[PDB]
Ligand binder design. Sequence first.
Ligand SMILES: CC(=O)N[C@H]1[C@@H](O[C@H]2[C@@H](O)[C@@H](CO)O[C@@H](O)[C@@H]2O[C@@H]2O[C@@H](C)[C@@H](O)[C@@H](O)[C@@H]2O)O[C@H](CO)[C@H](O)[C@@H]1O
Length: 572
Amino acid sequence: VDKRREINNEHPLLMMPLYANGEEFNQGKYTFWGGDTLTGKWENIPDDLKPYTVIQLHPDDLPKRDGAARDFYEHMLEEAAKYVNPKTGKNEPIPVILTVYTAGNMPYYTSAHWLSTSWIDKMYQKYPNLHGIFSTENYWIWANDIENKAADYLKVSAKNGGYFIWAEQNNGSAIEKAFGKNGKIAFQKSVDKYWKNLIFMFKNTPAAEGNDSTTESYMKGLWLSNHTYQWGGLMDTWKWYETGKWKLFASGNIGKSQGDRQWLTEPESMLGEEALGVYLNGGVVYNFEHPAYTYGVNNKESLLFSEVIKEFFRYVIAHPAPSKEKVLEDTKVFIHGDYSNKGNGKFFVNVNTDREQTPLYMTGRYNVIPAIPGVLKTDIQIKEITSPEFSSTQARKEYLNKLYPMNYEGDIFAQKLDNRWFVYNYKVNENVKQTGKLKFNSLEMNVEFEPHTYGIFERISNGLKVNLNNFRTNKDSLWSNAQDANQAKKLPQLTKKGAIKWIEEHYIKDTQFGEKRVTKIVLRGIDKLPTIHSLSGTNNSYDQPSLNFDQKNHMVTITINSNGNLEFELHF
Ligand SMILES: CC(=O)N[C@H]1[C@@H](O[C@H]2[C@@H](O)[C@@H](CO)O[C@@H](O)[C@@H]2O[C@@H]2O[C@@H](C)[C@@H](O)[C@@H](O)[C@@H]2O)O[C@H](CO)[C@H](O)[C@@H]1O
């Protein structure tokens, strides 16, 4: 059946979440938390991005009873279906994805429980603008018939030419079980027929359990082995709450005690560092939480959205991610087996991650090593997870080091694609500068990055194109009146409503921008003083870069002082 949309490297997808306000629904009003509206939100999306963005409805705290989610969803599907573009005056139905399964669809957790497969089929038939359905976050409540239900969602989507999109994390072997590890094989068999209509994403919310790397490995491997059409990630600023962090760089752990302050605190640019792990490995679907901080409120873009996500998403449209063909050519090792039997996220710590609790990598040398669970058949060295090479940290590196050569110097994350070096500082909550030395041919480039900074350096015919992002606003005001972790833990709760109000009042406006901070780029093998061209970036966020040319040493030091996004070319 003809696909309702394309999702691939040239046609990536940004999911745009809208969360139902259940309190207001009880009063007969149809509204979203944060005050976005379906029509206003769509209208605000830049026209260039509209072909690649889909509205994702989520039932959030709708009443947990029959009829509530169906009622709210039908209301919104009608709004989407009859939208009129005014400019054009033409009816242009808004593309929609419905959230249909979450928290195991337990009747004590979600109104989505009372959305039948029969109702889903009827919606797809009624609304050509319904492009897919979404299951999200079930690892902690792995319902008895989850795999059976997932098979039904995939089939009903394939029947109608829509996509079934599942965002899940390998906590408690979730991804392995989905494909039949524990004998529940309905979904495995569904995928054998309908993988062209499946999108599989990570969901990095449960940061305390450290399953980021293994989940992403699986996502990439399932894609490479034709067990999902495309893959991606849902990146979640609640990870800061899950790991008990508070004020940026501060000592002490406050555990899960200040939720609504905590999901605001993750550095804006760190979401781009996370998203790079998707792009660089051929993933093409992106989604974020908490929506109020990552997207915005009241139909306006937050600064995280405008300065990081929108720029990054424009980048992956203009430079499509590597194709399956290409990723597959580049893969030297493919793992077959269950990470859950080999320490789960611990498998990669001190291989390509610096700690158990991180969504980042410490080296791009192996990029992301792809895997599929042991229940799947295979169907490049394909290596069983139980083989001697994987028995320990050192063994893993020895084996991988023969097949993936060292291709840069320095304690920093860097990965190369064609003429481009992608670089970031991998520290999460420690204020440590990092440095690296990268080579194009010939041209040798050193960089020094503070934490929460990524750059893309592209060798061009007359020099170097640079895109830099270190956007990080000051969140200290949220942690005012707390001199240590003990005092922070006891602050009055910000609350969900208070945090939305803080965003309106102190983020969307009256922003406490962060201090400008220094990045250095050193070019070696240089004949003359390079010149800077096409300089642009976040408004009022950067000084004019400074150059220092040592003619005898064929080298130039470029000093940038900034806090935001930035782009320019050097000609030489
Ligand atoms: C109780 C609450 O504050 N709920 C809002 C909050 O929900 C997320 C957090 O509570 C997070 C803590 O790490 O746990 C996540 O489970 C939860 O996500 C929401 O619930 C799960 C089961 C899934 O359905 C998710 O899609 C959903 O977001 O933050 C979200 C927005 O990030 C909402 O405001 C919740 O109402």
